[PDB]
């Protein structure tokens, strides 16, 4: 019972756009210490994407005000905006640790050597969430999360290159997000571009091994690689 | 500046 | 101040799309037992509009799934959907009661007799929020909220007709919502249309009394009256 | 079926 009860709940919360409920449910499914299917795995990923997405979107807006207020020399107001920006940060960080803990305690730990596709998926996700911490961290805390993200992405990419077709959505997605890590977090555009251009070219090369069943996903992500490339290179 | 959906 | 610290907070939450934080802050502001300006009062109303809107939106979606599932004869699944739909319903009701409690303990209680504008505002708000309960109530609980809603709307309307120009945004907004109350909650379309047509025609009559500073709000609400009217009357 | 914004 209990598992299907939570999976059912997760699906209703997705339809209801109640992503905090969706996340508590997939957290509880994961904590059962049994493996996830592709479908379950995507529910986990959707739930946390949307939770943390709302925090980052909020963080960004308040951060932006804080910088304008510092610039304006407004001391009394700045202390209030900063407090609120930091409250939103605490919520954001908690969402990311919670995920990363699940990746460490359950999801990555339980992958076989031969579960290349799961390993790639969860490592990309570890990379993503350390990257979300890196968007808001400073000082020596920043350097740690920056490193952990790169280590995760690098490991996932090694495996994807060896074990996945260049047109596989999880690979392209990983490429897209790693290239973002380099461009935004590492402030290293040259590196970000080759990586994105390599993955694009590589997908282009093998288009006649794409089954119709994923023409939607892989062209969608390829389009986003090219947008990032034209945006950055200018 | 999109990331993976 | 405590009070300006809270209004500051509210405005930041609005910009951050953090409406539950926006609501805590306007609740606290209200709970100071002093009157709200128009601006303050619009912050309260925006805050709770968005909170309760999200619950209603969710409730509609799950309720709709519940009905399809009942019709499909799926017993095991239905008990699960129903549980969630009920959990959402308790949240929604809690938001409505919190608002209503404020209107009663503080906002409406502290209106002078000559605060026609505020009385109309809060009484439309009491109508709105009992109407939200009525969207989800059943049985005898339904009848009580339906009545309280109509009583609040009716009282606001008598005042606005007497004390406000037909082009005034609050008055038009009130007319729009009370006409929805009749159409959807009372299943009384004939009543809902006269009221909507009355308020529209009445605003059309007195357009050269509209200061430019309000042309955007009043024409907007007028447009919405006409939509409702065309949509309803075909049927 | 819109109400007042």
Residue of D nearest to C50 (CA): D5
Cα–Cα distances (Å) from A140 to A126, A143, A146, A161, in that order, read 19, 5, 10, 32
Cβ-defined contact of B3 to A221 (cutoff 8 Å): no
Distance from CA of C104 to the nearest CA of D (A): 22
Question: Measured between CB atoms, does A219 come within 8 Å of chain B?
Answer: no
> Phi first, then psi: what are they for A66, rounded to 5°?
-50, -45
- Alpha carbon separation from A89 to A58, A150, C17, C117 (Å, rounded): 9, 22, 15, 41
Using CB atoms, pick whichever of A5, A9, A61 lies closest to residue C15.
Answer: A61
> Which of C131, C160, C224 should be substituted to probe chain D, the one whose Cβ sees the most D Cβ atoms within 10 Å?
C224
| Phi/psi of residue C115, nearest 5 degrees | -90, 65
CB A32 within 8 A of CB A103: no
Contact yes or no for A174/A157 (Cβ under 8 A): yes
Using CA of residue A86, residue A88, residue A91, residue A94, what is the dihedral sign? negative
C173/D4 Cβ within 8 A: yes
Tell me how far apart the 2 most distant CA atoms of chain A are, in Å.
62
Chain B interface test: which of A176, A181, A218 (most B C-beta within 10 Å): A176
Question: Which residue in this structure is represented by tokens 């008598």?
Answer: C158
A220 at B interface, C-beta within 8 A: yes
**Three-state SS across chain A?**
CHHHHHHHHHHHHHHCCCHHHHHHHHHHHHCCCCCCCHHHHHHHHHHHHHHHHHHHHHHHHHHHHHHHHHHCCCHHHHHHHHHHHHHHHHHHHHHHHHHHHHHHHHHCCCCCCCCHHHHHHHHHHHHHHHHHHHCCCCHHHHHHHHHHHHHHHHHHHHHHHHHCCCCCHHHHHHHHHHHHHHHHHCCCHHHHHHHHHHHHHHHHHCHHHCCHHHHHHHHHHHHHHHHHHHHHHC
What CA–CA distance (Å, rounded) separates C233 from A160?
A: 60
3 state DSSP class of C164? coil
Contact indicator for C56, C132 with CB cutoff of 8 Å: yes
Structure tokens at C26: 């306007």
CA A129 to chain centre: 5
- The size of chain A, in residues, is 234
Q: Which residue has the tokens 């599932």?
A: C69
Chains with at least 3 CB pairs less than 8 angstroms from chain A: B, C
Exposure letters C98-127 (e unless 16+ CB within 10 A, then b): ebbebbeebbbeebeeeebbbbbbbbbbbb
- To the nearest 10 degrees (0 to 180), the angle between helices C38-71 and C75-102 is 160
Structure tokens at C187: 């299943």
Neighbours of C95 (CB within 10 A): 21
Domain encompassing residue C106: 1-235
Give Cβ neighbours of residue C83 (< 8 Å, ≥ 6 apart): none
Set of chain B residues whose Cβ sits within 8 Å of the Cβ of A176: 2-4
Question: C180 contacts in D (CB within 8 Å)?
Answer: 1, 3
C228 touches chain D (CB under 8 A): yes
CA distance C58 to A16: 5
Long-range contacts (CB closer than 8 Å, 24 or more residues apart) made by C48-53: C48/C23, C48/C95, C48/C99, C48/C129, C50/C19, C50/C22, C51/C19, C51/C20, C51/C23, C51/C95, C52/C92, C52/C95, C52/C96, C52/C99, C52/C129, C52/C132
**Cα(C50)–Cα(A222) distance, integer angstroms:** 37
Of A172, A174, A231, the CB nearest to B1: A231
All residues of chain C having their beta carbon less than 8 Å from the beta carbon of residue A15 are: 61-62, 65
Please report the resolution in angstroms.
2.7
The number of C-beta contacts closer than 8 angstroms across A and C is 50
Q: How far apart are CA C147 and CA C181, in angstroms?
A: 11
- A84 contacts in C (CB within 8 Å)? 9, 12-13, 16
Residues in CB range of C84: below 8 A, 6 or more apart: A9, A12, A13, A16, C62
Residue with tokens 């807006």: A61
CB-CB under 8 Å, C221 with D2? no
| DSSP one-letter code for C72 | T
Task: Give the mutation candidate from A5, A8, A12 for the C interface (greatest C CB count, under 10 A).
Answer: A12
Let me know if chains D and A touch, i.e. at least 3 Cβ pairs under 8 angstroms: no
Give how far Cα A85 sits from Cα of A78, C13, C224, D3, Å.
10, 10, 38, 34
C42-49: long-range contacts, CB 8 A cutoff, minimum separation 24: C43/C7, C43/C10, C43/C11, C43/C14, C45/C125, C46/C14, C46/C22, C47/C10, C47/C13, C47/C14, C47/C19, C47/C22, C47/C23, C48/C23, C48/C95, C48/C99, C48/C129
Chain B CB within 8 Å of residue A45 CB: no
- Contact assessment for residue C45 and residue C26, using Cβ atoms and an 8 Å cutoff: no
Q: How far apart are CA A32 and CA A34, in angstroms?
A: 6
- Tell me which long-range contacts C83-87 makes (C-beta under 8 A, separation of at least 24): C84/A9, C84/A12, C84/A13, C84/A16, C85/C59
Let me know: does C31 contact C106? Beta carbons within 8 Å: yes
Put simply, the chain C residues between 143 and 172 with a CB less than 8 A from any chain D CB are 172
Please tell me the distance from the alpha carbon of residue A81 to that of residue A63, in angstroms, as a whole number: 8
- The set of residues, in sequence order, having a beta carbon less than 8 Å from that of A108 and lying 6+ positions away, is A119, A122, A123, A126
CB contact under 8 A, C80 and A8: yes
Q: CB–CB of C228/C179 below 8 Å? A: yes
- Which tokens in the block code for residue C60? 């509609």
Side-chain-side CA neighbours of C205 within 13 Å: the count stands at: 8
Residue A220 is encoded by which pair of tokens?
């969608």
Length, in residues, of chain B: 5
Q: Give me the number of domains chain A comprises.
A: 1
On whether any CB of chain D is under 8 Å from the CB of C117, the answer is no
Question: Tokens standing for A156?
Answer: 């996932």
Residue C210 phi/psi, 5-degree rounding, is: -90, 115
A-B Cβ pairs (cutoff 8 Å, strict): 20
| Closest listed residue to residue A149, CA positions, set A94, A110, A186 | A186
Q: Alpha-carbon distance A59 to A86, whole Å?
A: 9
H-helix or E-strand containing C215?
A: helix C212-233
Q: Which residues make Cβ contacts (< 8 Å) with residue C185, sequence separation at least 6?
A: C131, C134, C135, C146, C149
**Chain A closest CA to B1's CA: distance in Å?**
6
- Nearest CB among C15, C54, C81 relative to A12 is that of C81
On chain C, the residues whose CB falls within 8 A of the CB of D5 are 220
Residues C223, D2: contact at Cβ < 8 Å?
no
Residue A221, chain B, CB below 8 Å: the answer is yes
Burial-class residue A120 by CB neighbours within 10 Å (0-12, 13-18, 19+): buried
A150 closest CA partner among A194, A113, A192, A108: A192
Interface of D with C in 1-5 (CB under 8 A): 1-5
Neighbours of C88 (CB within 10 A): 26
Helices A38-71 and A2-15: angle between axes, nearest 10 degrees:
50
Q: What is the rounded CA–CA span in Å between residue C134 and residue C208?
A: 38
Cross-chain CB nearest to C184 (options D1, D4, D5): D1
Residues 6+ apart with CB under 8 A from C29: C3, C6, C7, C10, C36, C40, C43, C44
Q: How far apart are CA C22 and CA C180, in angstroms?
A: 27
State the alpha helices, DSSP H only, in C72-168. Answer: 75-102, 116-134, 139-163
Query: Of C197, C101, C185, whose CA–CA distance to C150 is shortest?
Result: C185
Residue C225 CB neighbours (<10 A) = 24
Q: What is the CATH number of the domain that holds C139?
A: 1.20.190.20
């Amino acid at each position: 019972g209990d598992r299907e009860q939570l999976l059912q709940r997760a699906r209703l919360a997705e339809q209801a756009e109640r992503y905090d409920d969706m996340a508590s449910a997939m957290k509880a499914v994961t904590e059962l210490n049994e493996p996830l299917s592709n479908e379950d795995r995507n529910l986990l990923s959707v739930a946390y994407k949307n939770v943390v997405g709302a925090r980052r979107s909020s963080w960004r807006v308040i951060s932006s005000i804080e910088q304008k207020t510092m610039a304006d020399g407004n001391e009394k107001k700045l202390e209030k905006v900063k407090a609120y920006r930091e409250k939103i940060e605490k919520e954001l960080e908690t969402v990311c640790n919670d995920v990363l803990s699940l990746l460490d305690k359950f999801l990555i730990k339980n992958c076989n050597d031969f579960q290349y596709e799961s390993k790639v998926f969860y490592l990309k996700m570890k990379g993503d969430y350390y990257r979300y911490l890196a968007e808001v961290a400073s000082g020596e805390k920043k350097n740690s999360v920056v490193e952990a993200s790169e280590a995760a992405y690098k490991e996932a990419f090694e495996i994807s290159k060896e074990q996945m077709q260049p047109t596989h959505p999880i690979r392209l997605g990983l490429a897209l997000n790693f290239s973002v890590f380099y461009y935004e977090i590492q402030n290293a555009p040259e590196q970000a571009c080759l990586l994105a251009k390599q993955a694009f070219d590589d997908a282009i090369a093998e288009l006649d091994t794409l089954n119709e069943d994923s023409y939607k996903d892989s062209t969608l992500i390829m389009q986003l690689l090219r947008d990032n490339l034209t945006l950055w290179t200018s | 500046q999109r990331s993976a959906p």
